[PDB]
């Protein structure tokens, strides 16, 4: 099977919860080794922790993405750790809706945190995806950078950018030996709260959802294995829906 | 003809050349008076003089497009000037190929000069333009924004940001009166190899991008919002 990540190394960002905590549990039993990474020091140790008793290699971190030093020091956790970096998933991610007369400092965040943070980070993890033979970078964006609404200037518009970029920089490191590829998920139902989510707005959701579903975090997952995989070593700069076959307004 | 602009007030910023000042002073002879801003102080007061000279009403200043006050400070001519706001050309703008390792501050700057100022200017334009009783943005993007090639890291993403924060404002400022869209212009004489995929032959004119920013602006447009209209003579040049 070419769906494993025999001897990778991958660093998951904002990986505590939900997408990113899928993908570093499902990887580690793929066979990676896996640096997980959140805002909340904790929670990226209870899942590296998690990952190690039930039979893998992982190590978690602290990392605000939007601060240079806490991306250098990922970077260098990985190497010092495994030893080489082979995939990354920028999964660290935020924001939503916002009126169109936000304070500028809204807009910018928006991008600082969806669009700089995972660029840079790619930056620093290319050069050694390269030495290590090469690797898979994995941008979680979405379906707000392809779909278009109201209170949408910041989020729609930061991952419209990242949907560009990952089809963009596909170019730059293709050559390195890199792929670059994005997911854009439907509504899931991980983690998801029940006064946010009430049968209300789950059948509202469900109207335009042919599936007949919400989506799990292991969905994502299973899309994410795939595309950081040899099963899709000649597939690049791609941005892959994964929402049931509709779209969860 | 509903493809005239009688009784606009049109901001145009980086007008001093090129699409610019083809949209500036092709908007003054459709009736409107134009507000002509541009980095540089002389650029933007000679367009302004030359459509004066031809009969039009035209102010020019400098405006980085970048710098907060500077973007008041146009908002206030034009309303000093004129009485209202009711079309706002967000033509400034810059960037192109650059190394995936650029600096991150080379990164940064394409979204500042290419997206936050045309946002934020279109923030400070809008409620004047409700107050007029409608209006018409139109942004100047490029067909970096949904092509796909090497160097394209920052001004690709910068430009494909512009054309979906065109479609998704539509949504937030149509209740306004407000129209939204963009043009992503080809290649425009200021030859064989650029031309080799371009169905119609020819290289464009200045004055191709400004006839298409007057039917956009224009009550010939009141029901389109929204949309990033391509004009390069069916295809990509260079």
């Given at each position: 099977?070419?769906?494993?990540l025999?001897?990778?190394?991958?660093?998951?960002?904002?990986?505590?919860?939900?997408?990113?905590?899928?993908?570093?549990?499902?990887?580690?039993?793929?066979?990676?080794?896996?640096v997980?990474?959140?805002?909340?020091?904790?929670?990226?140790?209870?899942?590296?922790?998690?990952?190690?008793?039930?039979?893998?290699?992982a190590?978690?971190?602290?990392?605000?993405?939007?601060?240079?030093?806490?991306?250098?020091?990922?970077?260098?956790?990985?190497?010092?750790?495994?030893?080489?970096?082979?995939?990354?998933?920028?999964?660290?991610?935020?924001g939503?809706?916002?009126?169109?007369?936000?304070?500028?400092?809204?807009?910018?965040?928006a991008?600082?945190?969806?669009?700089?943070?995972?660029?840079?980070?790619?930056?620093?993890?290319?050069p050694?995806?390269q030495?290590?033979?090469?690797?898979?970078?994995?941008?979680?964006?979405?379906?707000?950078?392809?779909?278009?609404?109201?209170?949408?200037?910041?989020?729609?518009?930061?991952k419209?950018?990242?949907?560009?970029?990952?089809?963009?920089?596909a170019?730059?490191?293709?050559?390195?030996?890199?792929?670059?590829?994005?997911?854009?998920?439907?509504?899931?139902?991980?983690?998801?709260?029940?006064?946010?989510?009430?049968?209300?707005?789950?059948?509202?959701?469900?109207?335009?959802?042919?599936?007949?579903?919400?989506?799990?975090?292991?969905?994502?997952?299973?899309?994410?294995?795939?595309?950081?995989?040899?099963?899709?070593?000649?597939?690049?700069?791609?941005?892959?829906?994964?929402?049931?076959?509709?779209?969860?307004?």
């Amino acid at each position: 099977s070419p769906f494993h990540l025999n001897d990778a190394v991958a660093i998951v960002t904002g990986a505590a919860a939900g997408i990113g905590r899928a993908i570093a549990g499902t990887f580690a039993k793929a066979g990676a080794s896996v640096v997980v990474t959140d805002l909340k020091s904790e929670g990226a140790e209870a899942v590296a922790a998690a990952i190690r008793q039930a039979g893998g290699k992982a190590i978690g971190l602290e990392c605000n993405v939007t601060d240079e030093q806490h991306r250098e020091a990922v970077i260098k956790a990985a190497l010092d750790q495994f030893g080489k970096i082979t995939v990354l998933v920028n999964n660290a991610g935020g924001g939503g809706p916002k009126p169109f007369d936000m304070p500028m400092s809204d807009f910018e965040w928006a991008f600082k945190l969806n669009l700089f943070s995972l660029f840079r980070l790619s930056q620093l993890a290319a050069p050694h995806m390269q030495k290590a033979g090469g690797g898979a970078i994995l941008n979680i964006s979405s379906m707000a950078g392809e779909n278009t609404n109201v209170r949408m200037a910041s989020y729609g518009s930061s991952k419209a950018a990242v949907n560009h970029l990952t089809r963009n920089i596909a170019f730059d490191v293709g050559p390195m030996g890199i792929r670059v590829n994005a997911i854009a998920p439907g509504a899931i139902k991980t983690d998801a709260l029940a006064t946010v989510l009430t049968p209300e707005i789950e059948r509202a959701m469900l109207k335009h959802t042919p599936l007949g579903r919400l989506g799990e975090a292991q969905d994502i997952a299973n899309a994410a294995l795939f595309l950081c995989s040899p099963a899709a070593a000649w597939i690049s700069g791609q941005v892959l829906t994964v929402s049931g076959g509709g779209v969860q307004e």
